Structure formats: C-alpha cells, structure tokens
Design a protein around this ligand. Structure first.
Ligand SMILES: Nc1ncnc2c1ncn2[C@@H]1O[C@H](COP(=O)(O)O)[C@@H](O)[C@H]1O
Length: 631
C-alpha cells in the first residue's frame, strides 16, 4: 500500500516532485570543512527559487461595534522562496554588522523570545550569518527566570513577538544588558499587537531606558541600504559557541546547554540515520518552538533538503490539525501529546458514528482513514514519535491510523537528538554506552529478563557542558567521560535498549514496590475517558493517586460520583490490557475540568507535563486526599 502511494505521489503530485532534494546540494553541504554559516549559505543558493517557508494567510477584520481591528487566520498558507528568505536574513545581518554606532560582532549573544515563524527563522539565520550566539528563550519561562538567563548571558539584543512584550519589557526594566528591542511576528494593523508595541516603547521611554524599540521590518529596511555583511566562518581549529538551549530537570532551574558551531551544524545535516534522511522530500509542519532542539531540527533539517517548512499558526496546538490538514506534510514528527489528540478525535468520532445502522466491521477502519487523510493530510511517508514515552497500546493505535511504522526516537538536549531509534543505538553519533546499577531504585545488571540501570553515554553530539555552571557540569560526566543521562533503560542485547523512565520519576511505595510515574501516565492515556493525566504517589503511601482532566464526552451527563466510577472502570480495563500490577493502578483521583496548558504553567513548550509545577499546583490537595481516604 505505502509503496503504491509513493509511486502515485511521485507521478502525480507536482508539489512533492518539485521538492525532491538535490544530490549536488546535499553533497556540497556534506563537504568536510563546511562550517555552520557556510551550510546555510550553500543551502539558500542551491535551492534559491524553491518555496522554503510558509505561514498562514490572514486578513484584518474590523468589528464596527468595538471599532477594533483583529488579525483573523485564513484557511491557506503563503510561502516565500529560499532566495527571498536569505535576502531577508542578509538585510538583518547587514543592519547589525554595519551599524554606525553599535554594531554586533561574532561572539555577542542575541536573545529571541517567540515560537517558530518566518521572522524567527530570519533572526536565527542572521545570528548564524554573523556568528552571534543565539539564546532562544523558553516562552514558558517565568519573568524572573528570563531575567536570570539574561543576566547570565548579557545579550546585546532582545527580540520578542508582541505576545511576549509584557515579559520583554519587565526584563529590560530590571536593568538587563540588551541595547535594542526588536519586535517580530508583528502586525501593526492588529490593535492588540499595536497596543503591546506602543506600550513597550512608552514604558521604556518613561523609565528613561536608552533601549531602542523597533520592528523587524524597520531593521530590514535599514539593512537594505547597507553593504552585504560578511559570512562568519571560524578558524578550522576553532569551534566557538553558537547556541544555548536552555533545559530544566530535577531542580527546575534552567541550564544553558552549550551548542558549538559544529554541534549546531548537525541540526542541518546530521550524521545519524534519521538526521541523515538525505533524499526524503521534506514538506513539514513545524509546531515545536525554536527554543527546543526538536523544533530546530525540524526547521533546519528540512531547509537542508530543499523542502518547505510550514509554521503552525499558534504555539498551543490549538490550530495543529487545521494546519497539518492544509499543509499535508510528507513527514510528521509526533510528541505523545499529539498522539493523544489523534486518539481523542478517533474516540469522539467513533462514538458519534456508532449508531444503530453502523457496520462495526468497518467503522473503525473508516474513522482511522478519516484521521489519516483529512486530519494528518494523507501525504506523509514517514512518522516519528519522541521527547517522551509512548505506551505500547498507543503506539499500536497510531500505527493503525498511519498505516505505516511509527519510529520511536530517543534523545536529549545534552546527548543529541539521535541516540536511539526503534530501540537501536544509533552510530553515528553514539560512540559508547554502559548501564550503571541504581541499587536504591532496584535496577541492576543482574535483573529479571534484562539488565537494567542508568544509561551513561559517549557520543559525537554530547554537549561540553552547561553555560556558566561549572559544578553542575562536573556532576553530569563520570570519571571516564560518560554523560549521565539520568534515564533508566533495559538492555535487550548490545546496542538494543528499552527506555524505562527518568530516575527522577521512579517512586518507592511504602510496601517497597517501585513505580515509574511518567511511564504509567503514558499507559493510561489509552483510556477513552482521559484527556490528560498526572500521576502522583507518596513514599509514605502504598498506592497512587491521579489528577485527571476528563474528555468533554466523559463529562457529559455525569455527576462527580458517576464520572469517577466510569473512570475507575476504564482505568481497570487499561491496567488489565497492559498487564499492570495492582500497585501501579491509581486508586482515587482529583477531577480537573481545566486542561493543563503552557499558559497555566503545567505543560512545557513541547507539551510535556511540568512535574514540579503540577506538584506545586495539586500536591496539597492530593495529600489531603490521601488522609481523607485514610480517615
Ligand atoms: N523516545 C523517548 N521515549 C521516552 N522518553 C524520551 C524519548 N525521547 C526523549 N525522552 C525523554 O526526554 C528527555 C530529554 O528531553 P529534552 O532534553 O528536553 O530533549 C530524556 O531524558 C527522556 O526522559
């Protein structure tokens, strides 16, 4: 089936045919001495006349009752070519390099606060063009954390989308180093965005700040009237810092993972099997933020193949399936949250269509085909899931919907994106690994069917450490230079590993049994009644609780007691299918009707649960539930 789809595609679909990578360009990009900016330059020249990037079309609607004008999204995308994108980059790079008073120099830090967009890419590529160090701030971060990062990095420039200007201005009023505030993704005919921009300008002026607040459009206009900027190419023996990717773990404090010029280059053309992908057509919907490695690889990896990178219209996945259905990408990268959304759409549709006359011999297949064709676009050739665990049942469901394999990719900000693919160690980039016993969590080389322990890694893609964090950096490498992943794995055989959970997520119950709470959250995602779930336990208790956000369908026509009974029954079925032990099953739960979001601090920018924030939010209620059940 797949092979026939591909043949039809490459015979009838002119968009796909025109986007086929050029072997000659990929060869040039691969050349041994190519540095980061040269890769960018070579790609843009090589694919000049092709569509490179796309964003939702929009119009400006004026409500005559409020008199207010608002940007409204239209059901189509518009593109710009490689030539056009590189022209924009060149204008920015010229504006920054040839500035009469205070030009930017290689090694200077530039902070960017946004999502992922044509403008974001423009700014990011301009940093690369000049050898500036990009600091892609996590939009999920609290202002105090943003200020701490700015203090650490002392950037000379801050760029922000209008949605984040309130945060940007607070950062600048706190006396941080940026000399200019560049507003991008900016539509001045939208009254809300114009208000945000004018407020920023007014507030900084009122404070007596010397910061210059300007639009990206104005920066480009200035650059248009200047000579071309030099392309930064480091000494053959040098590998300067190019990028910091901030990441947070046990202690919620963000650390800046150091990406050198060479490490950042792997995001364009990697060396692994999946980041190699050299001849696959790359028509992509980018919905992960540029503040995450996955978002960067999604953009740069597609540009390196002369494909077309389409940007999702919103950062909270609220337009995701509209966007994917319009773009009809040839490849899709899933995070488990998105798989959940596909499953939840499937369940809603199946339930709705399961009427008296329905042929249940066939309805399941129809609903999945609807998802495959109309929600996922029907043109994808490959699919990958990563960033968090996907449970076996959900993986089987997804493969049934996709009608092709869902590759599981394991990696990290520290170690590299390509560590495991379908449980196989990837060489390159991996050089060596070992498992280390974790006695306190009951994981040993001598275990049940398979050795278990913490994964320690050597790889070409490991970071040198975290920016200005000497002690933390010392603690993440062992005495033989292995990076300590903090992740528990099971070793099926040499180079074949199964991810278990993060060490941090392993909980010992009062009876002595260990539970892996993120793994379990993934298992229960398969309940048709659960929209989201957070599992919580206490080492002083013998059983687990959960905070459950029910689906809208689950809530309909039920009171709390009946809803809890329904959820308990579904959890029981899921647990039996997944062969769980009794202690791995949540026994009681908090019903939460407000979903976890980026905005309320409970999801990350890639839609992973923020466990420290969930515990802060629900911990007191959950502990009270333990006592109330006790009494
Ligand atoms: N395929 C995967 N399966 C399970 N967990 C994963 C997978 N990929 C990444 N992770 C988790 O995500 C962490 C790294 O997240 P990040 O540095 O933000 O890229 C890892 O240490 C794992 O806990």
């Amino acid at each position: 089936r797949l092979q026939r789809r591909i043949a039809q595609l490459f015979a009838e679909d002119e968009q796909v045919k025109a986007a086929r990578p050029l072997e000659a360009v990929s060869a040039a990009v691969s050349a041994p001495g190519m540095r980061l900016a040269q890769i960018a330059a070579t790609v843009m020249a090589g694919y000049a006349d092709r569509p490179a990037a796309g964003q939702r079309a929009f119009e400006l609607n004026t409500d005559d009752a409020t008199g207010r004008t608002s940007l409204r999204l239209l059901p189509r995308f518009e593109t710009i070519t490689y030539r056009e994108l590189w022209q924009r980059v060149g204008e920015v790079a010229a504006a920054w390099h040839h500035d009469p008073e205070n030009p930017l120099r290689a090694g200077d830090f530039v902070a960017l606060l946004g999502f992922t967009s044509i403008d974001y890419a423009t700014l990011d590529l301009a940093d690369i063009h000049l050898g500036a160090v990009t600091v892609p701030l996590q939009a999920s971060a609290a202002v105090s954390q943003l200020i701490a990062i700015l203090t650490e990095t002392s950037p000379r420039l801050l760029a922000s989308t209008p949605e984040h200007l309130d945060a940007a201005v607070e950062c600048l009023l706190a006396g941080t180093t940026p000399e200019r505030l560049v507003v991008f993704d900016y539509h001045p005919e939208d009254d809300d965005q114009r208000a945000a921009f004018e407020s920023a300008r007014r507030r900084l002026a009122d404070a007596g700040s010397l910061v210059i607040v300007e639009t990206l459009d104005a920066v480009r206009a200035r650059g248009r009237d200047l000579p071309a900027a030099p392309l930064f190419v480091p000494d053959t023996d040098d590998d300067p810092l190019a990028l910091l990717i901030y990441t947070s773990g046990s202690t919620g404090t963000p650390k800046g993972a150091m990406y050198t010029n060479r490490l950042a280059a792997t995001m364009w053309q990697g060396n692994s099997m999946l980041q190699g992908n050299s001849q696959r057509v790359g028509i992509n919907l980018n919905y992960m933020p540029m503040s995450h490695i996955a978002g960067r690889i999604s953009l740069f990896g597609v540009l390196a193949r002369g494909g077309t990178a389409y940007f999702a219209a919103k950062s909270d996945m609220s337009t995701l399936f509209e966007d994917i259905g319009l773009v009809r990408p040839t490849e899709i990268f899933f995070v488990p949250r998105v798989c959940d959304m596909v499953f939840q759409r499937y369940q809603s549709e199946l339930d709705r269509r399961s009427v008296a006359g329905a042929d249940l011999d066939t309805l399941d297949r129809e609903v999945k085909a609807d998802l495959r064709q109309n929600y996922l676009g029907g043109r994808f050739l490959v699919a990958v899931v990563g960033s968090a665990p996907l449970a076996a049942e959900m993986k089987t469901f997804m493969e049934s919907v996709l009608d092709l394999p869902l590759h599981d990719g394991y990696g990290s900000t520290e170690a590299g994106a390509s560590v495991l693919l379908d449980n196989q160690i990837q060489r390159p980039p991996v050089l060596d690994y070992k498992l280390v016993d974790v006695p306190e969590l009951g994981y040993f080389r001598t275990d049940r069917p398979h050795p278990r322990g913490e994964l320690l890694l050597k790889a070409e893609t490991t970071i040198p450490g975290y920016y200005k964090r000497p002690e933390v950096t010392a603690e993440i490498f062992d005495e033989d230079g292995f990076y300590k992943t903090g992740d528990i794995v099971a070793e099926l055989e040499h180079d074949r590993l199964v991810y278990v959970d993060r060490r941090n997520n392993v909980l010992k119950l009062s009876q002595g049994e260990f539970v892996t709470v993120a793994h379990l959250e993934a298992v229960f995602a398969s309940s048709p009644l659960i929209r989201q779930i957070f599992i919580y336990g206490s080492s002083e208790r013998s059983y687990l609780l959960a905070v459950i956000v029910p689906t809208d369908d689950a809530l309909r026509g039920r009171d709390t007691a009946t809803l809890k009974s329904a959820l308990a029954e579904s959890i029981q079925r899921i647990a039996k299918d997944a062969n769980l032990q009794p202690y791995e099953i949540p026994r009681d739960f908090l019903i939460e009707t407000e979903p976890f979001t980026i905005a309320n601090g409970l999801l990350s920018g890639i839609a992973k649960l923020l466990r420290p924030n969930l515990k802060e939010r629900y911990g007191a209620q959950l502990e009270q539930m333990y006592t109330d059940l006790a009494t």
